[PDB]
Amino acid sequence: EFGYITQYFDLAQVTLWAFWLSLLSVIFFNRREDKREGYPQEAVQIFGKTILTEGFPFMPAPKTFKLPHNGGDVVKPGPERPQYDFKLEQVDRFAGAAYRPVGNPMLAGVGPGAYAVRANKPDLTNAGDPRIVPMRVAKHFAVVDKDPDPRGMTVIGADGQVGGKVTEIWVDRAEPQVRYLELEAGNKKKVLVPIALCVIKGQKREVKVRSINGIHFNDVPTLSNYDQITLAEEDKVSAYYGAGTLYATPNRAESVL
Amino acid sequence: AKSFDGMHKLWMIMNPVSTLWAIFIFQIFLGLLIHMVVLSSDLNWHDDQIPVGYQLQGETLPVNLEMKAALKD
Amino acid sequence: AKSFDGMHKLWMIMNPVSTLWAIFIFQIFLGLLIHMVVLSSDLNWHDDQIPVGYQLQGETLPVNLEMKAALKD
Amino acid sequence: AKSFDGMHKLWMIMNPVSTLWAIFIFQIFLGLLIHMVVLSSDLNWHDDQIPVGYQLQGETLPVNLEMKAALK
Amino acid sequence: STTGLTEAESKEFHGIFMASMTLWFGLVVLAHILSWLYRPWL
Amino acid sequence: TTGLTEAESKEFHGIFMASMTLWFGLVVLAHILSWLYRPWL
Amino acid sequence: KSTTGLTEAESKEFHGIFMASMTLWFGLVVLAHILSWLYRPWL
Amino acid sequence: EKSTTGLTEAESKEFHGIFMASMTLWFGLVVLAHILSWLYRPWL
Amino acid sequence: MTRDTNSNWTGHVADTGVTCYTCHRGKPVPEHVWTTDPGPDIPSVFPSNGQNTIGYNVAYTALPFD
Amino acid sequence: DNFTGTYKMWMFIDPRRALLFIASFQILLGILIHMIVLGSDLNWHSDGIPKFYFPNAAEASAPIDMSPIPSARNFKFD
Amino acid sequence: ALLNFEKKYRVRGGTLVGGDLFDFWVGPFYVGFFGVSAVFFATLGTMLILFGAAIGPTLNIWQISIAPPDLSVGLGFAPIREGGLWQVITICAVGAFVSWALRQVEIARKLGMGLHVPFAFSFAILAYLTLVFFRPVLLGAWGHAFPYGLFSHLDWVSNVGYQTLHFHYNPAHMLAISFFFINTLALAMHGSLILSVVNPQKGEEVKTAEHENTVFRDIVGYSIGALAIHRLGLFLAINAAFWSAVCMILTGPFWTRGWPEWWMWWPNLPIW
Amino acid sequence: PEYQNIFNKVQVREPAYPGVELPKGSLPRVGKPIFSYWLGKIGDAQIGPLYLGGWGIASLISGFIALEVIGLNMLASVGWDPRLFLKEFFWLGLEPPPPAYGLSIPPLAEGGWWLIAGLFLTMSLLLWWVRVYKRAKDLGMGTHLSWAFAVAILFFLTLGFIRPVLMGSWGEAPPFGIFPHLDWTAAISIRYGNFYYNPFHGLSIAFMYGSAVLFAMHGGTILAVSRYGGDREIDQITDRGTAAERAMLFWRWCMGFNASMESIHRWAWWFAVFCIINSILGIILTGTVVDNWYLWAVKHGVAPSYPSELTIDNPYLT
């Protein structure tokens, strides 16, 4: 009879319902784990008052990370360290309007140039030593020939001008690889540039840094001690180079078409 | 006729060893390819049964024929 | 007659050990390939049943024939 | 005839241990390969039923024949 | 010079390169004459 | 550069050419035997 | 420059024994083929 | 330089003694199993 | 056989029918025919399962070849 | 003799690794030989000696590949 | 609502079209010119799908279907009730997808980061355009594209597959499936490893990068690294999409036999 | 443009790293580590060393016995010729027993070798499971990689052992080939009426598409903030920097909600595991509970209904 039916309820049906309920429930738990960073959120009210809201579903109860080498406990969701001192002016009088920096945009720490407030300790290896270090402190590293050694090259800066010269390489001992280039700038300071913002040309013996301009290499943040770097300093350096992607030229933040 | 004078300067901008290796590898690949392309056409010279077919020659040896006769019984 | 004088200088730009290894490996691969290409044609010399067919020789031994006869009953 | 005088110097540029290992491994692989290529041809010597067929010999033993008769 | 060869070294290399290429093409021509005599394809 | 001087290169070249000539000789001999046994053209 | 650390004396020694071993191996191969030709000639 | 296991020569002698005894006993049991199987169901 | 097909099987060859030329096409032995396929050569104690080869009659698949 | 110093073997071959290899290999080889012998004419579980214990099919053919799934259990195919 | 740390990043600039007119947020979303475009096109497309369901036989969610024109229309313009609605919706869909990608580019420019995500999205867009534009144009008719319906585009997939007798033997199809499977395996291993290192055995400290390398070198003998696994990920997903597009542009335009017969080039090489 | 971070431009070497110290009583690691320049262009350059203990040797003996069996049967199917083996390699296979033999142990050349290879491959994968568990637990880490591996093993055992036993035939299992196992896939869809109307098959396809989507998204997002140190996820988890902040703002602004640097890895875990859970559920019900998936979908109001215009006469009714 080709399509005769004996009974409407079967096992495939029930099992499908069970799956709909088993999904729909890992969504719940994952969405709750999503809110251990950045919450409670700030909802702005009808006439400017700000309250803390928590969303749907609600925030989870705090858990603890025990960091190694007596690096302390981290509770999440927990307290926050205080923001620094960014200045901003709103552009249009409603909660969803954008903001403008008030002073020199490069030295303001807002927009792509914002950074976080991390610990003032270096990241450690499994043995307790600082992880990112110059190649004169890590005496066992060597650049593989077949590859252009950047030490000596110049640091052209996106408008064609010279920034300085490369004098050191900063390596990562936990995973052997290059993280920073150190260079002497135009006013004879020592500044770092991340290796992921550098195009290295071996034959021209140049390093092109498209982010900032040549004269901008004088105001890159500096380090305390030059035998190690801390989490805070990493953030400051990288953020300064990221501010130039929108603030270097006055025409960069200005609608392509 | 003097327009090809500076040609020897080519090797001041092209690396000689890299170029030699590239040429050799390309020539070997092309050799294999052309032999395979001609073997897959009417010009094939291994299977054309010239100057004689050898499998057919083996099937019709008197010893093999006499053994095949005594089996078909 | 004097075009190929400096040829021995080849080994001052090309590494001798790498070249030797490359040559040896290529020659072995080519040896295997040509043997396999000729075995898959009419020139095959293992299966041509020359100078005699040995499977056919085994099928028609008198002992095997007499045993196959006593199974038809 | 004195063209192959310095041949012994070969081992000052080619590593002896690497060469030994390569030779041994290649020889074993080639041995297996040639045995398999010849066994798959008309020269096969395991299945040719020479000097006698053994499965056929087992099917026609008098004990097996008398048992197959009493079944049928 | 981006390859490190001077002009004398380049001249030397060029001499031998051209000689070798000419010899190779000669051998190719000979192979084709033999093939045409044996099995003409056009 | 390979670090070989010109004398070392001359030496290597001598033995390389001798070896290649001997190898090609053996190849020619194998083909003459094969033509005598089973001519293919 | 690529080098193996062997001097010329060590290379001579290695070469002597290598050639002896290869000759013995090829001798055994020839013997195996003579037996196979006597049993089952293939050409 | 050379690959070692840290065993001295006395420890190696001891291990070897017991290893050989155990292997001999195992092979004895194998032979016995095969004699029984041949008595029950001969295969050659 | 041709008369039988032309008269009794019109559910398939409806009023067009067949002649000799439909298969012989001017030759005594037709071009596309078949016989019971033995399969490739395998060891003598191995029975044929009838698949896992190239399979020229089943469109070059690894499906059962006969 | 010639085998006087064989016990020194364990000074460069690790006896722990040796034991771990041998035990594993022997157990796996045991399983393998049993399954190989069971898949032949020497099989001793379904051979009908000293008696067939199951209600087997009365006429079971020689199974081919183009077959359906059987309706009842059966262990006597020969 | 704003996150705890969000306010210092909400600055103006970074746009492509428009300028200061559409540079605001609505709730958590960022709008822009392309935000307006995307919502416009999504709303219009959805409403037209619903109307095409209303003039059909049923409003059951599983059985709605809007079909493309016939093959006799060619690359022309079909009546509204017999194909033109499908054409309008397929214009809206392209508009919405491209708007989505460009909005992503604006956002990434504002936050100071690289354009890897819109670039990887471009390959999904390319596969869609292969199925609705390139393959139909090369074959000469819009009616070679798939209908819009759950369960009803699956009938299309099935019959198109069987137009070549056995679609599993398509080579670019095999290569794409390889990439899909390996991608799921890699994602499982990556998820597991990070979770395992920050959620260790009870009463232990968070582990380090050395532990991550050691575990896979112990199990398998090689560890790719914490930055290269992200690369490997972008690579496997993009390649899956790419070879899907190739496999569909091959079927019909460049090959009309069965797919098993293509592979016949291999055992016919004159070298075995 | 700007550097995209796809290849390593400058490489550096230090002496090989032997690995985190193991608990006392462990075997040494075997092998001397070597370095690969080409592997170092895209990732880590060190190869080895390797840990071989009790469970990973029993595994690797089982697996290689299985491989020898499979290879030799494929080779016997062409008459021992290696030339033909290479010529017709994608068409060869080791085939399961004929379905009429049921669940008995068949003779060796009519399905017994398939049975042997299946048993040895099974044991190999279970020993490997124990190895993976112990390796992660001896270093003090959570055992999350063993849970996912367990799911995958269960899918391998379902199609292959559990479903053939519940059906009553070993001949319902896949063979060991390339084109042969593709043929099995198509045939089991044809026999049980169209897998496109199996709902667990649709859900697993949803999750396989989702795996590709999610991993393109995550790989992109972390390569796009690696200029701010985003590829170092453990530190961004235990001390949130600007890379994590930018990464979570991007998705919040784009689609309205986001995850954190630790939570996205739980989404990855689940998307990879639900795919295979639905795979198991869809195969285990086929044949044993449902005989035609299209008729099931018609009974539950799922299949569309094309207009007819004609009438075709079923010749078995005439």
Ligand code: BCL
């Ligand atoms: C009907 C077609 C003809 C045929 C027509 C042709 C034609 C036409 C050509 C060949 C050529 C070649 N043929 Mg033929 N050939 C046929 C059948 C065969 C068979 C066989 C199994 O049946 C074999 C094995 C060959 C093999 C060869 C090679 C010798 C050669 C290609 C070498 C190469 O590409 O190097 C490429 C590699 C490099 C360039 C690397 C560097 C090479 C260095 C310098 C040394 C290599 C030595 C050289 C190959 C050998 C010649 C040296 C002399 C003995 C002095 N032919 C049939 C009978 N053949 C080509 C040739 O003869 O070249 C001169 C050629 O033009």
Ligand code: BCL
């Ligand atoms: C109808 C076809 C003929 C046939 C026609 C030919 C032709 C023609 C040739 C061969 C050649 C060879 N044949 Mg034959 N051959 C046939 C059947 C066989 C069978 C068999 C199972 O039937 C085998 C096993 C062989 C094997 C061989 C090799 C000995 C040799 C290829 C070596 C090589 O690859 O070096 C490549 C590897 C290297 C160069 C690496 C470096 C090795 C160094 C230099 C030393 C190696 C030693 C060498 C292998 C042996 C020399 C020992 C004696 C001094 C002769 N032939 C049939 C009967 N054969 C070739 C040959 O003889 O070369 C001289 C050759 O030209």
Ligand code: BCL
């Ligand atoms: C119709 C074909 C003939 C046949 C014709 C030939 C021919 C021809 C040859 C062989 C050769 C061999 N045959 Mg036979 N052979 C047949 C059937 C068999 C069968 C079988 C199961 O049927 C087996 C197991 C063998 C096995 C062997 C090996 C002993 C040998 C391959 C050696 C090798 O590969 O070393 C390669 C590995 C190395 C070199 C590694 C180095 C290790 C060192 C040097 C020690 C190795 C010991 C070595 C294997 C044997 C030396 C024997 C001692 C003097 C006792 N043959 C049939 C009947 N056989 C070859 C041989 O005899 O070599 C001299 C050979 O030329």
Ligand code: BCL
């Ligand atoms: C027709 C064929 C016969 C048959 C013929 C044989 C033959 C022949 C042999 C066996 C052997 C064995 N048979 Mg039986 N066997 C039959 C039917 C069976 C059936 C069954 C369900 O029908 C079972 C379960 C067994 C099981 C066994 C095992 C006890 C033993 C395999 C030991 C092993 O795997 O190595 C395990 C090895 C190790 C782990 C390494 C060494 C052992 C050390 C000392 C430590 C292990 C502990 C302990 C000693 C383990 C074994 C227990 C006994 C005391 C031996 N046989 C049928 C009737 N069987 C083998 C045997 O007897 O070994 C002595 C053997 O030679």
Ligand code: BCL
């Ligand atoms: C009988 C049928 C044949 C078959 C016939 C076909 C046909 C026909 C096709 C495939 C295609 C595919 N097949 Mg197949 N296939 C078969 C068996 C298989 C099997 C298997 C296990 O047997 C597997 C694993 C596959 C796997 C695959 C993939 C390689 C490929 C699908 C991925 C893709 O296209 O991405 C590409 C991604 C897209 C097209 C997605 C587009 C994304 C757009 C831009 C974004 C949409 C957003 C949306 C509207 C927003 C909603 C928003 C809400 C707010 C949430 N096939 C059987 C044998 N297969 C397809 C293909 O390759 O096409 C290119 C294809 O056309």
Ligand SMILES: CC(C)=CCC/C(C)=C\CC/C(C)=C/CC/C(C)=C\CC/C(C)=C/CC/C(C)=C/CC/C(C)=C/CC/C(C)=C/CC1=C(C)C(=O)c2ccccc2C1=O
């Ligand atoms: C439509 C309508 C009625 C409109 C009216 C509303 C009006 C008037 C205007 C609103 C303004 C605008 C412009 C709105 C547009 C938005 C609209 C309407 C719709 C779009 C919503 C949309 C497309 C959502 C789809 C969501 C889905 C299904 C996602 C699939 C993938 C998925 C399940 C992901 C979950 C995991 C997540 C959250 C991944 C993101 C994520 C990844 C991938 C990381 O790598 C990462 C790394 C480090 C930290 C964080 C992260 C992170 O969060």
Ligand SMILES: COC(C)(C)CCC/C(C)=C/C=C/C(C)=C/C=C/C(C)=C/C=C\C=C(C)\C=C\C=C(C)\C=C\C=C(/C)CCCC(C)(C)OC
């Ligand atoms: C020539 O080659 C040599 C010998 C030199 C070695 C080389 C090896 C090579 C080239 C191998 C090539 C292998 C290939 C291509 C393999 C292809 C494999 C594929 C794609 C396989 C796909 C699927 C197979 C599956 C899913 C099988 C599942 C089987 C299972 C789960 C078996 C279960 C059986 C059990 C648990 C045993 C029960 C038995 C018992 C005794 C209890 O029954 C009562």
Ligand SMILES: [Ca+2]
């Ligand atoms: Ca010829």
Ligand SMILES: [Ca+2]
């Ligand atoms: Ca012969």
Ligand SMILES: [Ca+2]
């Ligand atoms: Ca014999």
Ligand SMILES: [Ca+2]
């Ligand atoms: Ca019994």
Ligand SMILES: [Fe+3]
């Ligand atoms: Fe990650």
Ligand SMILES: [Mg+2]
């Ligand atoms: Mg099959």
